Amino acid sequence: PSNVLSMAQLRTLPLADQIKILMKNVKVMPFANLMSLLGPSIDSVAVLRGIQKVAMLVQGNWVVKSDILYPKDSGVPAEVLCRGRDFVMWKFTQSRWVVRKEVATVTKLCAEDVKDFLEHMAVVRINKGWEFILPYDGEFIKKHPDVVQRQHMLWTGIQAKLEKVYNLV
Ligand SMILES: [Zn+2]
Ligand SMILES: [Zn+2]
Ligand SMILES: [Zn+2]
Ligand SMILES: [Zn+2]
């Protein structure tokens, strides 16, 4: 609506708010673009810290965390939606391409929710499934090996949770 903050208004807020607000609006973002938006005043060590609080690494790009889109209060409990979306996001760490029917079969969620999860980080491609919306960011990955390894361990934790509640493979 009309209640959107301009970038100059955004840049007067605490750094944690800027990153949260940007990522919730723009759900997928390359790190270098986030740095550009926040402006030349900010240091990247603080942004590397801040982005991991609110987003996960996917294909070298940053994707806003599910609990930001679906906070604990939508008649479906927020944790059920978070789990479904986290599954989709997990699938995209494995591959740029995701088959909608596999998401429906595994999450057993409503077709509207499955579409909601996919369409805000991917677009359907004719006869090939849903393709993650940003290209693989090989440059961020090359330049931040420590963060990439950490994020891969965090995904290890998330996948273990998903394997407990869902029936993967
Ligand atoms: Zn989550
Ligand atoms: Zn619903
Ligand atoms: Zn939308
Ligand atoms: Zn990985």
Residue numbers in the entry: 264 to 336, 342 to 437
Give sentences copied directly from the paper behind this entry.
To gain insight into the structure and function of RPC5EXT, we determined the structure of its individual domains by X-ray crystallography. Of the two tWHDs, tWHD1 is the most conserved while tWHD2 is absent in Caenorhabditis elegans and Drosophila melanogaster. Thus, one possibility is that, analogously to A49 tWHD, the RPC5-tWHD1 participates in an interaction with the upstream DNA and bound transcription factors, thus stabilizing the human Pol III PIC.
Pol III is a multi-subunit complex composed of 17 subunits. The TFIIF-like RPC4/5 and the TFIIE-like RPC3/6/7 subcomplexes are Pol III specific and can be regarded as built-in general transcription factors that play a fundamental role in Pol III transcription initiation and termination. A notable exception is the subunit RPC5, which in metazoans encompasses a long C-terminal extension (RPC5EXT, ~450 residues long), whose function is currently unknown. The RPC5EXT is formed by two consecutive tandem winged helix domains (tWHD1 residues 259–440; tWHD2 residues 556–708) connected by a 115 residue-long flexible linker.
